[PDB]
Amino acid sequence: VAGPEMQVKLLQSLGLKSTLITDGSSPINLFSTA
Amino acid sequence: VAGPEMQVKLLQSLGLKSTLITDGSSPINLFSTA
Amino acid sequence: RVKKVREMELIYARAQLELEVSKAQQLANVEAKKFKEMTEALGPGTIRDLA
Amino acid sequence: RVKKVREMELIYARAQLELEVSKAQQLANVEAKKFKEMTEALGPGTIRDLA
């Protein structure tokens, strides 16, 4: 669950472009070394 | 959790472009060384 | 012929292994020690504020 | 033949191992020393504020 949503705010506007721008600055490396 | 969402604010506007621008400045280285 | 020659290049590869290790180990120590000195030489957070 | 020479070049690269270490150790020492002298020579904050 690091794709948010973005938101931003603002307002504004613008166009073309966007915003931012920046590119540049510085760085550280250079610064560282230095 | 380095991508917020862013937011920014503003308003404004614008366009084209964006804003921022810046580039430049310077650086540281140069300054440182120087 | 090939049993003897076999154990030969073998005892060699094993000796020249701890050689590989001894070298690769000592140098990764000088790095870490030099790095620990580099880091400590400027604020434990001077690195952090520069970041 | 090969057993003899194999121990030769062996014992050699072993003394030549601690030599390399010696070099890269002392040089990393003088670098970290020289660097610790640089950092200290201008403010612990001065380096941070130039950052």
Closest CA to C19 of B15, D9, D28: D9
Count of pairs with CB atoms under 8 A, one residue in C, one in D? 56
Cα separation, D5 vs C43, whole angstroms = 52
| Closest residue of chain D to C48, computed from CA coordinates | D48
CB contact under 8 A, A3 and B4: no
Contact list, A4 vs chain B (CB under 8 Å): 3-4
Q: Give the technique used to solve this structure.
A: X-ray
How remote is the C-alpha of C25 from its chain's centroid? 2
Q: Return the partners of chain D (3 or more C-beta pairs < 8 Å).
A: C
B/e letters for C13-31, b = 16+ CB within 10 Å, e = fewer, are eeebeeeeeebeebbeebe
Q: What was the resolution (in A) of this experimentally determined structure?
A: 3.5
Q: Which of B33, A31, D31, A29 is nearest to C33 (CA)?
A: D31
Contact partners, residue C39, CB within 8 Å, separation at least 6: C47
